[PDB]
Amino acid sequence: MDDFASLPLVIEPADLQARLSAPELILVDLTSAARYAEGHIPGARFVDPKRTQLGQPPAPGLQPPREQLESLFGELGHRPEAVYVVYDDEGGGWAGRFIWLLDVIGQQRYHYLNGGLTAWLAEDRPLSRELPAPAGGPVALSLHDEPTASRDYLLGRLGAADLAIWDARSPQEYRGEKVLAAKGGHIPGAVNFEWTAAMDPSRALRIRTDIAGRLEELGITPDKEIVTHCQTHHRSGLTYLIAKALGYPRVKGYAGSWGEWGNHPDTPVEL
């Protein structure tokens, strides 16, 4: 992992600024076309958040088809020596979903910029409006199912003693007060910890330093397989990232998410 090998998954703006010139670095920006043009971290390559999703029914939260992925990573310059540093400007949702995609394509070396652009801007660090040269054509990818939980898999795991379902939606959605699908409520046995509650607005949206204890209070512990989700696996991108960052050995993103679960005929719901 070269210059980044010594750093933990979640790194700080100072760690990144000092390594912006690393040759193996593939800095990924998942803010927005406007934000990216206005000013991005030097060397950052833009990946529109929509490009990280299938975007088609019945489950748009799923990963993009193989073709889109091969083209995307080909443009980013995906190569053997690559070390990814990911960031967004919303507290980590999209960045975390991208890291999940990195797991999906077998990438082993990557890091999350704690607080992303928010933290970077809060410390008035260097910005660029220049475009990095795209790598090239699409590259062949080895896709993995392990980082993801399918509807069938979760259905067969419900009630499991060694399973914790981290529902990252808002409390009102979890309780079925706000219904965005045919069925309201949550997955049976799931616990709720809104993605926004994992951020610290007083620290430029960095992951709250007391995050471990908060997850533990809800039974979301490393000794359990952690399956996380939201409405479309966006907000759960951050929660997925957090579990991995804390060293949780078994973590999966239920990409289908409530968009699927709340609408599927076979799925039981709980208030």
Coordinates of all heavy atoms in Angstrom, one line a residue, residues 87-98 112-113 115-116 195 199 205 234-239 241:
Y87 N -13.8 10.1 -0.6 CA -14.5 11.1 0.2 C -15.7 11.7 -0.5 O -15.8 11.5 -1.8 CB -13.5 12.3 0.5 CG -13.2 13.2 -0.7 CD1 -14.0 14.3 -0.9 CD2 -12.1 13.0 -1.5 CE1 -13.7 15.2 -2.0 CE2 -11.8 13.8 -2.6 CZ -12.6 14.9 -2.8 OH -12.3 15.8 -3.8
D88 N -16.6 12.3 0.2 CA -17.7 12.9 -0.3 C -17.9 14.2 0.5 O -17.0 14.6 1.2 CB -19.0 12.0 -0.2 CG -19.4 11.6 1.2 OD1 -19.2 12.4 2.1 OD2 -19.8 10.5 1.3
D89 N -19.1 14.9 0.4 CA -19.3 16.1 1.1 C -20.6 16.0 1.9 O -21.2 17.1 2.1 CB -19.3 17.3 0.2 CG -20.5 17.3 -0.7 OD1 -21.1 16.2 -0.9 OD2 -20.8 18.4 -1.3
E90 N -20.9 14.8 2.4 CA -22.1 14.6 3.1 C -21.9 13.8 4.4 O -22.9 13.2 4.9 CB -23.2 13.9 2.3 CG -22.7 12.6 1.7 CD -23.8 11.7 1.2 OE1 -24.9 12.2 0.7 OE2 -23.7 10.5 1.4
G91 N -20.7 13.6 4.9 CA -20.5 12.8 6.1 C -20.1 11.4 5.8 O -20.1 10.6 6.8
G92 N -19.9 11.0 4.6 CA -19.5 9.6 4.3 C -20.4 8.6 3.6 O -20.0 7.5 3.4
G93 N -21.7 9.0 3.4 CA -22.6 8.1 2.8 C -22.1 7.5 1.4 O -21.9 6.3 1.3
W94 N -21.9 8.3 0.4 CA -21.4 7.9 -0.9 C -20.0 7.3 -0.8 O -19.8 6.3 -1.5 CB -21.5 9.1 -1.9 CG -22.9 9.5 -2.2 CD1 -23.4 10.8 -2.0 CD2 -23.9 8.7 -2.7 NE1 -24.7 10.8 -2.4 CE2 -25.1 9.6 -2.8 CE3 -24.1 7.4 -3.1 CZ2 -26.3 9.1 -3.4 CZ3 -25.3 7.0 -3.7 CH2 -26.4 7.8 -3.8
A95 N -19.2 7.9 0.0 CA -17.8 7.4 0.1 C -17.8 6.0 0.7 O -17.1 5.1 0.2 CB -17.0 8.3 1.0
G96 N -18.7 5.8 1.6 CA -18.8 4.4 2.2 C -19.4 3.4 1.3 O -19.0 2.3 1.3
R97 N -20.3 3.9 0.4 CA -20.9 3.0 -0.6 C -19.9 2.6 -1.6 O -19.8 1.5 -2.1 CB -22.1 3.6 -1.3 CG -22.8 2.7 -2.3 CD -24.0 3.3 -3.0 NE -24.4 2.5 -4.1 CZ -25.2 1.5 -4.1 NH1 -25.8 1.1 -2.9 NH2 -25.6 0.8 -5.1
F98 N -19.0 3.6 -1.9 CA -17.9 3.3 -2.8 C -16.9 2.3 -2.3 O -16.4 1.5 -3.0 CB -17.2 4.6 -3.2 CG -16.2 4.4 -4.4 CD1 -16.7 4.4 -5.7 CD2 -14.9 4.2 -4.1 CE1 -15.8 4.2 -6.7 CE2 -14.0 4.0 -5.2 CZ -14.4 4.0 -6.5
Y112 N -10.7 6.0 4.0 CA -11.8 7.0 4.0 C -11.3 8.2 4.7 O -10.6 8.2 5.7 CB -13.0 6.5 4.8 CG -14.0 7.6 5.1 CD1 -14.6 8.2 4.0 CD2 -14.3 8.0 6.4 CE1 -15.5 9.2 4.2 CE2 -15.2 9.0 6.6 CZ -15.8 9.7 5.5 OH -16.7 10.7 5.7
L113 N -11.5 9.4 4.0 CA -11.1 10.7 4.5 C -12.1 11.1 5.5 O -13.3 11.4 5.2 CB -11.0 11.7 3.4 CG -10.7 13.2 3.8 CD1 -9.4 13.2 4.6 CD2 -10.7 14.0 2.6
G115 N -14.6 12.9 7.6 CA -15.2 14.2 7.4 C -15.1 14.7 5.9 O -15.7 15.7 5.6
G116 N -14.5 13.9 5.1 CA -14.4 14.2 3.7 C -14.1 15.7 3.3 O -13.3 16.3 4.0
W195 N -27.9 7.0 10.2 CA -26.6 7.4 9.7 C -26.1 8.8 10.1 O -24.9 9.0 10.4 CB -26.5 7.3 8.1 CG -27.1 8.5 7.4 CD1 -28.4 9.0 7.6 CD2 -26.5 9.2 6.4 NE1 -28.5 10.0 6.7 CE2 -27.4 10.2 6.0 CE3 -25.2 9.2 5.8 CZ2 -27.1 11.2 5.0 CZ3 -24.9 10.2 4.8 CH2 -25.8 11.1 4.4
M199 N -22.3 10.8 12.7 CA -21.5 11.9 12.4 C -21.4 13.0 13.6 O -22.4 13.0 14.4 CB -22.0 12.7 11.2 CG -22.0 11.9 9.9 SD -23.1 12.9 8.8 CE -23.7 11.6 7.8
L205 N -18.3 16.9 10.4 CA -18.9 15.7 10.0 C -18.0 14.4 10.0 O -18.2 13.5 9.2 CB -19.5 15.8 8.6 CG -20.6 16.9 8.5 CD1 -21.3 16.9 7.1 CD2 -21.7 16.6 9.6
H234 N -27.7 3.8 0.5 CA -26.8 5.0 0.3 C -26.3 5.4 1.7 O -25.1 5.4 1.9 CB -27.7 6.2 -0.3 CG -27.0 7.5 -0.1 ND1 -27.7 8.7 -0.1 CD2 -25.7 7.8 0.1 CE1 -26.9 9.7 0.1 NE2 -25.7 9.2 0.2
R235 N -27.2 5.7 2.6 CA -26.9 6.1 3.9 C -26.2 5.0 4.6 O -25.2 5.2 5.4 CB -28.2 6.5 4.7 CG -28.8 7.8 4.2 CD -30.2 8.0 4.9 NE -31.3 7.2 4.4 CZ -32.5 7.2 4.8 NH1 -32.9 7.9 5.8 NH2 -33.4 6.4 4.2
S236 N -26.5 3.8 4.3 CA -25.9 2.6 4.9 C -24.5 2.4 4.3 O -23.8 1.4 4.7 CB -26.7 1.3 4.6 OG -27.0 1.1 3.3
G237 N -24.1 3.3 3.4 CA -22.7 3.2 2.9 C -21.8 3.6 4.0 O -20.8 2.9 4.2
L238 N -22.2 4.6 4.8 CA -21.4 5.1 5.9 C -21.4 4.1 7.1 O -20.3 3.8 7.6 CB -22.0 6.4 6.4 CG -21.4 6.9 7.8 CD1 -19.9 7.2 7.6 CD2 -22.1 8.2 8.2
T239 N -22.5 3.5 7.4 CA -22.5 2.5 8.5 C -21.7 1.3 8.1 O -21.0 0.8 9.0 CB -24.0 2.2 8.8 OG1 -24.6 1.6 7.6 CG2 -24.8 3.4 9.2
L241 N -19.1 1.3 6.2 CA -17.7 1.8 6.3 C -17.3 1.8 7.8 O -16.2 1.4 8.2 CB -17.7 3.2 5.8 CG -16.3 4.0 5.6 CD1 -16.7 5.4 5.2 CD2 -15.5 4.0 6.9

